[PDB]
Amino acid sequence: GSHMVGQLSRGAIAAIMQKGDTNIKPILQVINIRPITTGNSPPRYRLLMSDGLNTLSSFMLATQLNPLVEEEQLSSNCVCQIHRFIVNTLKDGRRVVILMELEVLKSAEAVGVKIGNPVPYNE
């Protein structure tokens, strides 16, 4: 429907990264998904997600959610509710938001476009 940016939890990315809020169940859009280099361990997917205001490229799917990408079209443009996530910090100090449970509210094909004009979140 109209006001597509109203579909997304504007400000949730800043809340996750600055406040470390994990109680929220924000609605985000997938902008892109790609594998990372994992050698002889399970494939792992990194996501560029949008909350309508910001994009952030430091999301990863928990391994348990891999089938959503492999089989069920979790893909660019879909709109998802994040039901459970955590944030982990790597040795270099960068943070990764690991999506543990998520629900696709609208398929990529039902949305079809990057909603709004989100800009990259800076650290």
Q: Which residues bind ligand 1EJ (CB under 6 A)?
A: 36-38, 41, 44, 46, 58, 60, 88, 90-92, 94, 96, 98
Comparing C-alpha atoms, which of 104, 95, 109, 120 is closest to residue 28?
Answer: 104
Helix runs in the chain, H state only:
12-14, 66-71, 108-111
Shortest CB 75 distance to ligand 1EJ, Å: 17
Cβ closest to ligand 1EJ, residue 7 vs residue 51? 51
- What's phi and psi for 61, nearest 5 deg? -80, 135
Shortest CB 63 distance to ligand 1EJ, Å: 8
Cβ closest to ligand 1EJ, residue 100 vs residue 110? 100
Shortest CB 4 distance to ligand 1EJ, Å: 26
Is 58:14 a contact under the CB 8 Å cutoff?
A: no
SS3 101: strand
Cβ closest to ligand 1EJ, residue 90 vs residue 113? 90
